[PDB]
PDB file of C-alpha atoms in Angstrom:
ATOM      1  CA  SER X   1      20.765 -22.579  17.877  1.00 19.57           C
ATOM      2  CA  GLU X   2      20.679 -19.287  19.821  1.00 16.68           C
ATOM      3  CA  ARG X   3      21.151 -16.887  16.910  1.00 17.65           C
ATOM      4  CA  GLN X   4      18.573 -18.402  14.560  1.00 18.69           C
ATOM      5  CA  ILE X   5      16.054 -18.713  17.390  1.00 17.80           C
ATOM      6  CA  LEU X   6      16.492 -15.029  18.122  1.00 16.08           C
ATOM      7  CA  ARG X   7      15.894 -14.066  14.500  1.00 15.41           C
ATOM      8  CA  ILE X   8      12.779 -16.269  14.312  1.00 16.56           C
ATOM      9  CA  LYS X   9      11.412 -14.553  17.441  1.00 16.42           C
ATOM     10  CA  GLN X  10      11.975 -11.160  15.810  1.00 15.04           C
ATOM     11  CA  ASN X  11      10.109 -12.276  12.684  1.00 20.30           C
ATOM     12  CA  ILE X  12       7.240 -13.559  14.825  1.00 20.32           C
ATOM     13  CA  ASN X  13       7.003 -10.145  16.478  1.00 21.20           C
ATOM     14  CA  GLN X  14       6.967  -8.317  13.149  1.00 18.62           C
ATOM     15  CA  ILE X  15       4.198 -10.693  12.014  1.00 19.69           C
ATOM     16  CA  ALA X  16       2.205  -9.963  15.154  1.00 20.76           C
ATOM     17  CA  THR X  17       2.614  -6.267  14.288  1.00 18.85           C
ATOM     18  CA  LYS X  18       1.256  -6.802  10.799  1.00 17.31           C
ATOM     19  CA  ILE X  19      -1.656  -8.795  12.285  1.00 16.89           C
ATOM     20  CA  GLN X  20      -2.488  -5.909  14.650  1.00 16.48           C
ATOM     21  CA  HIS X  21      -2.505  -3.510  11.705  1.00 15.82           C
ATOM     22  CA  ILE X  22      -4.719  -5.951   9.721  1.00 17.35           C
ATOM     23  CA  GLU X  23      -7.269  -6.372  12.533  1.00 16.87           C
ATOM     24  CA  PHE X  24      -7.600  -2.592  12.861  1.00 16.22           C
ATOM     25  CA  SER X  25      -8.120  -2.262   9.108  1.00 15.25           C
ATOM     26  CA  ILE X  26     -10.827  -4.913   9.160  1.00 18.00           C
ATOM     27  CA  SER X  27     -12.593  -3.256  12.107  1.00 16.08           C
ATOM     28  CA  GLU X  28     -12.660   0.160  10.418  1.00 15.68           C
ATOM     29  CA  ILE X  29     -13.933  -1.504   7.231  1.00 15.33           C
ATOM     30  CA  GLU X  30     -16.741  -3.255   9.125  1.00 16.05           C
ATOM     31  CA  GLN X  31     -17.727   0.037  10.764  1.00 15.88           C
ATOM     32  CA  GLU X  32     -17.843   1.642   7.292  1.00 14.73           C
ATOM     33  CA  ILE X  33     -19.975  -1.198   5.983  1.00 11.00           C
ATOM     34  CA  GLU X  34     -22.456  -0.809   8.856  1.00  8.54           C
ATOM     35  CA  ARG X  35     -22.605   2.952   8.262  1.00 12.20           C
ATOM     36  CA  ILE X  36     -23.362   2.317   4.604  1.00 11.25           C
ATOM     37  CA  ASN X  37     -25.916  -0.473   5.251  1.00 11.12           C
ATOM     38  CA  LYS X  38     -27.790   1.855   7.584  1.00 13.58           C
ATOM     39  CA  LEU X  39     -27.838   4.840   5.221  1.00 15.36           C
ATOM     40  CA  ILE X  40     -28.892   2.575   2.302  1.00 14.29           C
ATOM     41  CA  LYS X  41     -31.725   1.517   4.587  1.00 16.34           C
ATOM     42  CA  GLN X  42     -32.667   5.112   5.557  1.00 14.43           C
ATOM     43  CA  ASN X  43     -32.735   6.366   1.987  1.00 11.08           C
ATOM     44  CA  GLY X  44     -35.201   3.588   1.255  1.00 11.00           C
ATOM     45  CA  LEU X  45     -33.201   1.399  -1.125  1.00 10.98           C
ATOM     46  CA  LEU X  46     -35.434  -1.688  -1.352  1.00 10.94           C
TER      47      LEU X  46
ATOM     48  CA  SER D   1      18.457 -28.594  15.999  1.00 15.00           C
ATOM     49  CA  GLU D   2      18.664 -27.215  12.456  1.00 13.43           C
ATOM     50  CA  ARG D   3      15.813 -29.128  10.795  1.00 15.61           C
ATOM     51  CA  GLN D   4      13.237 -27.959  13.297  1.00 14.82           C
ATOM     52  CA  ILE D   5      14.578 -24.437  12.749  1.00 13.65           C
ATOM     53  CA  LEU D   6      14.069 -24.815   9.012  1.00 17.29           C
ATOM     54  CA  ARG D   7      10.555 -26.188   9.602  1.00 19.82           C
ATOM     55  CA  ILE D   8       9.682 -23.060  11.602  1.00 21.20           C
ATOM     56  CA  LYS D   9      11.216 -20.708   8.991  1.00 15.85           C
ATOM     57  CA  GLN D  10       9.127 -22.407   6.333  1.00 17.57           C
ATOM     58  CA  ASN D  11       5.943 -21.822   8.365  1.00 18.13           C
ATOM     59  CA  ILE D  12       6.941 -18.127   8.734  1.00 18.46           C
ATOM     60  CA  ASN D  13       7.310 -17.745   4.977  1.00 19.74           C
ATOM     61  CA  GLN D  14       3.927 -19.449   4.474  1.00 19.10           C
ATOM     62  CA  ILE D  15       2.346 -17.083   6.936  1.00 18.28           C
ATOM     63  CA  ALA D  16       3.949 -14.001   5.360  1.00 19.81           C
ATOM     64  CA  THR D  17       2.588 -15.068   1.983  1.00 23.89           C
ATOM     65  CA  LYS D  18      -0.856 -15.368   3.525  1.00 22.53           C
ATOM     66  CA  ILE D  19      -0.494 -11.905   5.117  1.00 22.52           C
ATOM     67  CA  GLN D  20       0.381 -10.613   1.652  1.00 25.21           C
ATOM     68  CA  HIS D  21      -2.766 -11.931   0.014  1.00 22.25           C
ATOM     69  CA  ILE D  22      -4.811 -10.672   2.924  1.00 20.78           C
ATOM     70  CA  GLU D  23      -3.370  -7.146   2.664  1.00 20.09           C
ATOM     71  CA  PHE D  24      -4.131  -7.117  -1.068  1.00 18.94           C
ATOM     72  CA  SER D  25      -7.763  -8.219  -0.542  1.00 21.97           C
ATOM     73  CA  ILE D  26      -8.034  -5.414   1.992  1.00 19.03           C
ATOM     74  CA  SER D  27      -6.698  -2.952  -0.581  1.00 17.75           C
ATOM     75  CA  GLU D  28      -9.367  -4.012  -3.062  1.00 16.56           C
ATOM     76  CA  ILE D  29     -12.113  -3.736  -0.450  1.00 18.55           C
ATOM     77  CA  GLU D  30     -11.026  -0.212   0.578  1.00 16.05           C
ATOM     78  CA  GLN D  31     -11.137   0.887  -3.060  1.00 15.12           C
ATOM     79  CA  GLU D  32     -14.583  -0.643  -3.581  1.00 11.98           C
ATOM     80  CA  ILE D  33     -15.818   1.164  -0.478  1.00 11.86           C
ATOM     81  CA  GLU D  34     -14.280   4.464  -1.662  1.00 12.12           C
ATOM     82  CA  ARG D  35     -16.167   3.957  -4.925  1.00 12.28           C
ATOM     83  CA  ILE D  36     -19.468   3.244  -3.169  1.00 11.42           C
ATOM     84  CA  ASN D  37     -19.006   6.333  -0.968  1.00 13.92           C
ATOM     85  CA  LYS D  38     -18.353   8.404  -4.050  1.00 16.84           C
ATOM     86  CA  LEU D  39     -21.555   7.335  -5.772  1.00 17.72           C
ATOM     87  CA  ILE D  40     -23.446   7.759  -2.498  1.00 17.27           C
ATOM     88  CA  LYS D  41     -22.267  11.365  -2.225  1.00 18.12           C
ATOM     89  CA  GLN D  42     -23.071  11.947  -5.875  1.00 20.89           C
ATOM     90  CA  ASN D  43     -26.656  10.725  -5.662  1.00 19.32           C
ATOM     91  CA  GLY D  44     -27.176  13.021  -2.704  1.00 18.27           C
ATOM     92  CA  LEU D  45     -28.421  10.424  -0.229  1.00 22.30           C
ATOM     93  CA  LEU D  46     -29.146  11.755   3.285  1.00 21.97           C
ATOM     94  CA  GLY D  47     -27.466  10.598   6.522  1.00 20.93           C
ATOM     95  CA  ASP D  48     -23.802   9.443   6.635  1.00 21.48           C
TER      96      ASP D  48
ATOM     97  CA  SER L   1      16.406 -24.832  23.189  1.00 21.00           C
ATOM     98  CA  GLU L   2      13.498 -27.254  23.582  1.00 16.40           C
ATOM     99  CA  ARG L   3      10.918 -25.219  25.590  1.00 16.22           C
ATOM    100  CA  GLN L   4      11.707 -22.175  23.474  1.00 20.20           C
ATOM    101  CA  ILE L   5      11.140 -24.058  20.202  1.00 24.41           C
ATOM    102  CA  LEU L   6       7.870 -25.414  21.568  1.00 21.74           C
ATOM    103  CA  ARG L   7       6.668 -21.907  22.514  1.00 23.36           C
ATOM    104  CA  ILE L   8       7.617 -20.632  19.119  1.00 23.07           C
ATOM    105  CA  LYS L   9       5.474 -23.396  17.591  1.00 23.71           C
ATOM    106  CA  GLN L  10       2.647 -22.531  19.930  1.00 24.88           C
ATOM    107  CA  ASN L  11       2.799 -18.915  18.742  1.00 26.43           C
ATOM    108  CA  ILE L  12       2.848 -20.094  15.142  1.00 24.66           C
ATOM    109  CA  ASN L  13      -0.386 -21.961  15.705  1.00 28.23           C
ATOM    110  CA  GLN L  14      -2.055 -18.986  17.438  1.00 25.56           C
ATOM    111  CA  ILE L  15      -1.040 -16.851  14.494  1.00 23.77           C
ATOM    112  CA  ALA L  16      -2.371 -19.433  11.985  1.00 23.98           C
ATOM    113  CA  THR L  17      -5.654 -19.497  13.904  1.00 23.06           C
ATOM    114  CA  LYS L  18      -5.953 -15.674  13.852  1.00 20.50           C
ATOM    115  CA  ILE L  19      -5.209 -15.626  10.112  1.00 22.32           C
ATOM    116  CA  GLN L  20      -8.040 -18.128   9.600  1.00 22.42           C
ATOM    117  CA  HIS L  21     -10.484 -15.897  11.476  1.00 21.45           C
ATOM    118  CA  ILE L  22      -9.291 -12.940   9.401  1.00 21.10           C
ATOM    119  CA  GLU L  23      -9.907 -14.773   6.104  1.00 20.41           C
ATOM    120  CA  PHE L  24     -13.429 -15.595   7.221  1.00 21.03           C
ATOM    121  CA  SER L  25     -13.953 -11.898   8.140  1.00 18.05           C
ATOM    122  CA  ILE L  26     -12.728 -10.829   4.699  1.00 16.37           C
ATOM    123  CA  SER L  27     -15.075 -13.311   2.962  1.00 16.59           C
ATOM    124  CA  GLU L  28     -18.015 -11.868   4.923  1.00 16.55           C
ATOM    125  CA  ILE L  29     -17.073  -8.285   4.076  1.00 17.27           C
ATOM    126  CA  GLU L  30     -16.846  -9.280   0.405  1.00 15.81           C
ATOM    127  CA  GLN L  31     -20.339 -10.794   0.487  1.00 15.30           C
ATOM    128  CA  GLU L  32     -21.790  -7.687   2.154  1.00 14.77           C
ATOM    129  CA  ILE L  33     -20.144  -5.464  -0.482  1.00 18.13           C
ATOM    130  CA  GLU L  34     -21.582  -7.726  -3.193  1.00 19.19           C
ATOM    131  CA  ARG L  35     -25.043  -7.256  -1.636  1.00 21.18           C
ATOM    132  CA  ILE L  36     -24.609  -3.489  -1.371  1.00 18.69           C
ATOM    133  CA  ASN L  37     -23.658  -3.297  -5.078  1.00 18.02           C
ATOM    134  CA  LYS L  38     -26.754  -5.317  -5.892  1.00 14.73           C
ATOM    135  CA  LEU L  39     -29.025  -2.882  -4.016  1.00 19.60           C
ATOM    136  CA  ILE L  40     -27.350   0.163  -5.509  1.00 19.99           C
ATOM    137  CA  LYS L  41     -27.863  -1.343  -8.973  1.00 18.74           C
ATOM    138  CA  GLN L  42     -31.545  -2.219  -8.470  1.00 18.40           C
ATOM    139  CA  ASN L  43     -32.213   1.333  -7.288  1.00 18.90           C
ATOM    140  CA  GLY L  44     -30.741   2.870 -10.427  1.00 20.17           C
ATOM    141  CA  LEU L  45     -28.187   5.034  -8.657  1.00 17.86           C
ATOM    142  CA  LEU L  46     -25.927   7.171 -10.869  1.00 17.13           C
TER     143      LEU L  46
END
């Protein structure tokens, strides 16, 4: 059915949008974790 | 082809639920990191 | 509607596969944060 297929496609797109947003969030987080790991290292913790 | 349509819609719900949990875990992580940054600043560590 | 339904299902699988990679990324971040909290603790910060 044409109408339901169309709606499904729209939902898929919105989900791909949320996945984009999520991947960015994870990348920023991993950058922050590296930054922290490195400063923890430089301040001589262990 | 209604049953295959329903099958797909079910998968979409299942995915959205997964996205939800994921977003929440991210929330918690971001707050933990904010906390760690705070205590880092407070103890006057160099770098950043 | 057949080729369209099949492509939709293809996209569903690619999304499911991405979500799996994202969960693994989150698990790794959570372990690194656990480790960071350990080191901060051992060093008597704050």
